[PDB]
Symmetry: C4
C-alpha cells in the first residue's frame, strides 16, 4: 500500500468536499428563470425551494420557520429549550397559515415526550437530530416514531456520513436521511475528535444507499456559497440544510452586534461551550449581518437557477444526474 | 469509485488550470526574436499577434480596438450600449485605416438587428457572445449568421468548456470557438452557480473537437501572466482573449483612480451588478494602471517569444504541439 | 516513472500526515463516557490514559511526571542534566506514591552509567532516546539493557520512521518502539537535513513490523489537536507522546512569559541551539499558557472519547482497527 | 485522458520540486562528523564540499571565488563585465594560492574570445552559461571548447531540464551538465514564459542520461535550505550551485542595505531589467545579510552531514542511492 501498512482498506476512500469539484456545463434548453426548483424534503413532502434552515438556536425559531416556509422552504425548530416552548413555537408557526414546519428531537430521556408534544402541536416533520445516527438507540427512536406517528408525520434521521449508516436509517424507516459529520462551518469535530467525511463524497455514498429506496438525502453543513447548493444537489441530495448562510439574517434569533464599524450576528454550534451551558465540538462565532431572509434566499435560489441553466437541468431530479470535474489545489 | 458512489463517470475528469502546468523546454533552433507569432483568429483571418481584447465595457471600445489592430491583434467591441453607438464605434475603427475589428452580439431580441447594423458598418468578425453556447438558440444564431452573411463576415461562437459543446458550435458553422466557462478574473460563476471547467483541460477538450475540422480555438479568461498565453496556445488554442491584462491600459474605457497613492482603473464583469444596471456572476473591481497598450502587448508578446524559443517552436502551429509537465501544490 | 528517472523505488511511498486523513464514523454502541481509554505503553505496562509527556527540558521534570502519572499517563524525564539530578528526580516521583515513571538515556559515554543510576532510583521505563535508532550502537544499547535489567525495567527504543527500523528494534528486544523522525512542532530536521516521514504513514509502517510481535508503538511528535491523538491510535499506535500540547501547562518547567498582553511559556527542541549550549535541528519557541495539566488532559481525553464513540470503539484495541478517509488540500 | 484531450503524452510527466519530497532514514553506521562530503564537480575535478557559487554579479566575483575554494567548494565568475576584468578576476584568484576557479561564458560574439582570455588567465572550469542549452549553437560551443582546450580545462554546459537535453550535452562532450530551467529564487521564467521543470524531477531525468556516461550533474537553482542540498544530491546530482543562499554573505558583491532596522544585500537575476541595462526573466530583490561565507557553508554542510547520518550514506555516491517519500500539500 503506497500510503503505508499492508491493508488497502485502512484508507477506505478519497474524500471530496465542495471546493474539490465544479459542475460541468451540458447541453441546455433550460433558462434559469424557467427551471423548476421544487424537490422532495421527505418521501411525501415536496418543497418549492430545496432549502431548510438548521435546528440551531442561532438560526431557527418561530420567526425563521415562518419566513422559510413562506419562501417555499422549511424551518426545523431547534430543541435547546423546554418542551413546552418548542411546542408553543410550533403552534405559533401554524397560526401564521398552513405553513410546513419541522422540529428537532434527540434520543435522550425527554426526547419521546418531546416528540409527542410536538405532534400534538401539529408538527409536520420530526427530525431525529444527533451527532452520529449509526447507533441502535437512534435507529430505534426513528423506528418507534415511524411506527407510532408515521401516518401523520414524516420522520427524518441524521446525521450520517457513510453508505452503511444511511442504509441503516433506511431500514429503520426514515423518510429522509440527513448527511453531515464534520463539515459545519462552526464545527470542530474534525479537530477535536479527528472524525469526519468530506461532504461531496458523503453525499455520493449516502445517495448510493438512499436513492434505490426512494429516500431523499438532506445535505447538511459546509455550504458557504449558493454554488455549493447546486453541487450538493448534483451529488444526489434532494435538499440542503443551511446554518451559517441564514444565521446572519434579520429573521434569525439574536441581536445585532457592531464590531469595528461593521454589523454582525452571533452564530454558534449546538456543541459549543455556551450552547451546552462531552467536550465541545463547536465554536461560538459571528457572521456578517445579511438583512432579510427573503433577500438571501433569492440570491441562493438565483445561483441554483444559474446552475440548472448551465447543466440543462429542467428539474432538481435532472440536476441530480449532472456531472462534475474535479479540480486541483491551484483552482 | 474511490471518491464515492458507484458511478465512475459522475466525476468525469480531472481539470487542470494554467497554474497546474509548465511548458517543457525542447530542442530548439529558434531565437525569441525570430519566432513567427502570427496565428488564426478564425478559419480565414490570421493575426500578426495572437491576442484579442475582451468584449467588455471596461476593456474594449473604439480606442482599444484601434490600438489592438495596430499592435497586430484585434478588439471585440462590447455590446452593452445601443445598437447605433456600437455600429458607430465600428465605423470609427474603419475610419482609422484598414483595421480588423470584431463586435459582440447576443441571442436576444435586438441581437439580429444588432448584427445587421454591425455588418452594415463594415465589421469583420461577429462574436456571438453568451455565457453558455451549448444551447439551440445560440447554435441557431451562429448558423443563421453564417448562412446570411457568412461570405463577408467571420462568425465566432462562445463560450464553451466541453468537447461536446465545441463540437456543436462546429456543426453549426462557427469559424472559431471561444472557450471559457468559469475562469475569468472577475468571474464568480464558480462560486455563484458552482459551475466551471479549469481552462487548460477545457482548451484540450475543445481543441479535440475543433482542430480536426480546422476551426481555431480562442482561449478566453483566466490569463494572468504572459506565460499563461504560451500555455493556452500550447494546449491547442490559436489565440487568447484578454480582459484583466488589458483593462489597466490607457486605451481602455474609464478614468484613472487614485487609491492610497497608487493608480488604478476600474474593471468589472459584464455579469456584475453594475454592468446589468439573473443574479450577478461577476464582480466590480480595480486593476493597477499599466500605461500604454503598446507597452503591455510588447511584454506579453515578449513572454510568448521566450516560450517559443524554449520549446523550439518557430510558429504558433509548432507551439500547439509542445508538451507540459504537471506540477504539484508545492510549485 | 511519471515523476522522473527509471527507478520506481526511488520515491518509495506517498507519506500522509495527520492533516491528510479523517476517521470515518462507524456503527457504534459506544458512548464517549463509557469508552475504555486504557492502552499498552510497553509489552507489560498498561496506562489508564494513552498519553506520555516528552523527554524535553521544557516539558518533563519531576512535577510533570507526577501530574502525568496521577492523570493516568506517564512522564519520561529528560536527560539534559547531570545523572545525579535525573536519578534524584526519579526518586522524587516515587516519593509521591506508587507512580509510574520513565527516563531518557542516550547511547553516549555516560549513557550506560546513567541507566544504572536510574535503575537504582527505581525507574520503571528506560527510554533509549535518539534521533535515529536504526543504528547498531542504539540497537546494542537496547539489547544490553534488555539483557541486564530486562526483568525489572521496560526498555523503549526510538525514534524510527520506517518498517525496517521498527523491525530492527523489535529484534533487539524493545518492549515498545517510538515513532517520529521529522514531525515535531519545534523540529527542523525536515528543513535542515531534508529528512523525515509523514507521521500517519510512519505509524502504519512501524505498526506493520511491531504489531505482529506484540510490541506497542508510541506515536511521537506532530500532534497538534486532540483529534490527532485519535488518528495516531487508529493508525495503529498504542500511545502518543506529547511535547507542544503539554509545554504550555503549569506543571511544565519554566516561567510564565508575558508578550503583548498574552501569557506564554517557552518551548524548545532538544536539538535547538540553546538546548545544546552537529548543527541545530530544532527551534526555541513559545506556546500559549494553558493552565493546569489536569485541564489539558481532560480536553485531550475528551476528544479521544468522542472519536471512540463515532467509530464504535469500546477499547483502544478496537480503535486501532478503525478506517480513514484521505482528504484533499481543500479540506 | 483524464486531464483532457486524446493524447496521453501531452502532459508528459508529474514534476516534483524539493518541497514535494523528504529523504527516508535508513540503516546507518555513519555519524554526521564522519561522513565524506567530497564529490565530482566534473569528470576530473573532485571538490571537498559539493557546493559551487552561481555565476551572478550579486554572488560571485574574485572575493567569493577565493572564499568558496578555501571552504572546499568553487566559485564560477560571472560574465557581466568586460573580458579583461573577468580574466583579471581569474588571475586574482590564482594569486591567492592553488585555488580552483571557474568562469562563465556565453555563446555570443565575444564568447569564444572570452573563453580564450580565461584560459590564458589559468581558469580550471569553463561554464557555458545559457538559459537553454538544448540548442545547436550551445552544443557546438561546448564541443569546440572540449576539442580545443579539453586537455587543460573542464567544460560545463547548462542549463537543461530534460533527459534529452542532458543527453545532447553529453554527446557534445560536456564534463558536467547543469540542471535548472525555472527554479531560481529570482527567476520569473515560469510566469513570463510559462516554461520550467520542477527541480527534483529535472535532476532525476538528467541523471538518467548523465550517470550512465559518468558525467556529473550540477543541481542549479531553487535551493532554499540546507535540506534541499541533500535532496538534490540524493536525486542524483553530484554538486549544487547556490545563488540566494550565498548572496547575503559578506564575500558577495554589493553593499549592506538597511531596511526597517534590518540588514540586507541586493540580489538580482542575470535576466532582470537592471542586469541587462528579450523581456526580463528575473527580478531584482533583497536577501537578509548572513555574515561570513564560512559561517553559511558550515551550516549548509552541517545539514548535509545530518542527512548522510540519517540515510547511512558514508559518501556522496552512497547518498545518491537514497530513497524519498513524496509528501502532500498538508506537509
Ligand atoms: O457544535 C456543532 N458541532 C458540529 N456540527 C454542528 C454543531 N452545531 C451545528 N452543527 C451542524 O452544522 C450544520 C450547519 O453548518 P453550516 O451551515 O456550515 O454552518 C448544522 O445544521 C449541524 O448539522
Ligand atoms: O461577469 C462575468 N462573469 C463571468 N465571466 C465574465 C464576466 N465578464 C466577462 N467575463 C468573461 O471573462 C473574460 C476576461 O477574463 P480575464 O481576462 O481573466 O479578466 C472575458 O473575456 C469574459 O469571457
Ligand atoms: O530539536 C529537536 N529536533 C527534532 N525533534 C525534536 C527536537 N526536540 C524534541 N523533538 C521530538 O519532538 C517531539 C515533540 O513534538 P511535538 O509534540 O509536536 O512538539 C518530541 O517528543 C521529540 O521526539
Ligand atoms: O534572471 C534570471 N532568470 C532565471 N534564472 C536565473 C536568473 N539569474 C540567475 N538564474 C539562475 O538561478 C540560479 C540561482 O538560483 P537560486 O539559488 O534559487 O537563487 C542561478 O545559478 C541561475 O541558474
Ligand atoms: C451534527 O451537529 C452536532 C455535532 C456535535 C454536537 O455536539 C457534540 C458535543 C456531540 O454531540 N458529540 C458526540 C460525539 C459522539 C457521539 I457517539 C455523540 C455525541 C452537536 C451538534
Ligand atoms: C462568459 O462571460 C459572462 C458570463 C456570465 C455573465 O452573466 C451572467 C449573469 C449570465 O449571463 N449567466 C447565465 C447563466 C446561465 C445561462 I443558460 C445564461 C446566463 C456575463 C458574461
Ligand atoms: C527526535 O528528537 C530529536 C531529533 C534531533 C535532535 O538533535 C539533532 C541535532 C540530532 O541529534 N541530529 C542527528 C542527526 C542524525 C544522526 I545519525 C544523529 C543525530 C534532538 C532530538
Ligand atoms: C538560467 O539563468 C538565466 C535564465 C534566463 C536569463 O535571461 C533571460 C532574459 C533569457 O536569457 N531568456 C531566454 C529564453 C529563451 C532562449 I532560446 C534564450 C534566452 C538569464 C539567466
Amino acid at each position: 500500500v503506497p500510503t503505508g501498512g499492508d491493508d488497502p482498506t485502512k484508507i477506505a476512500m478519497l474524500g471530496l468536499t465542495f471546493d474539490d469539484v465544479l459542475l460541468l456545463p451540458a447541453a441546455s434548453d433550460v433558462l434559469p428563470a424557467n427551471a423548476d426548483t421544487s424537490s422532495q424534503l421527505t418521501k411525501k413532502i415536496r418543497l418549492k425551494v430545496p432549502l431548510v434552515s438548521s435546528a440551531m438556536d442561532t438560526v431557527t425559531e418561530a420567526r425563521m420557520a415562518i419566513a422559510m416556509a413562506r419562501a417555499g422552504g422549511m424551518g426545523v425548530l431547534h430543541r435547546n429549550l423546554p418542551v413546552a416552548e418548542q411546542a408553543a413555537q410550533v403552534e405559533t408557526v401554524k397560526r401564521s397559515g398552513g405553513l410546513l414546519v419541522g422540529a428537532a428531537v434527540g434520543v435522550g430521556d425527554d426526547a419521546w415526550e418531546r416528540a409527542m408534544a410536538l405532534r400534538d402541536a401539529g408538527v409536520d416533520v420530526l427530525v431525529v437530530d444527533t451527532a452520529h445516527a449509526h447507533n441502535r438507540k437512534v435507529l430505534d427512536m426513528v423506528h418507534r416514531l415511524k411506527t407510532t406517528v408515521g401516518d401523520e408525520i414524516e420522520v427524518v434521521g441524521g446525521n450520517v456520513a457513510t453508505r452503511a449508516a444511511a442504509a441503516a436509517l433506511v431500514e429503520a424507516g426514515a423518510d429522509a436521511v440527513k448527511v453531515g459529520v464534520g463539515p459545519g462551518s462552526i464545527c470542530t469535530t474534525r479537530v477535536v475528535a479527528g472524525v469526519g467525511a468530506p461532504q461531496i463524497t458523503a453525499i455520493l455514498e449516502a445517495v448510493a444507499a438512499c436513492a434505490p429506496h426512494g429516500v431523499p438525502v438532506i445535505a447538511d453543513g459546509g455550504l458557504q456559497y449558493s454554488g455549493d447548493i447546486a453541487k450538493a444537489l448534483a451529488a444526489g441530495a434532494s435538499t440542503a440544510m443551511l446554518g451559517s448562510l441564514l444565521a446572519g439574517t434579520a429573521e434569525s434569533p439574536g441581536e445585532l452586534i457592531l464590531v469595528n464599524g461593521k454589523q454582525f450576528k452571533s452564530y454558534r454550534g449546538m456543541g459549543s461551550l455556551g450552547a451546552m451551558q462531552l467536550v465541545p465540538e463547536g465554536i461560538e462565532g459571528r457572521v456578517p449581518f445579511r438583512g432579510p431572509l427573503s433577500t438571501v434566499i433569492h440570491q441562493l435560489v438565483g445561483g441554483l437557477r444559474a446552475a440548472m441553466g448551465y447543466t440543462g437541468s429542467a428539474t432538481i431530479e435532472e440536476l441530480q444526474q449532472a456531472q462534475f470535474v474535479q479540480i486541483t489545489a491551484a483552482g
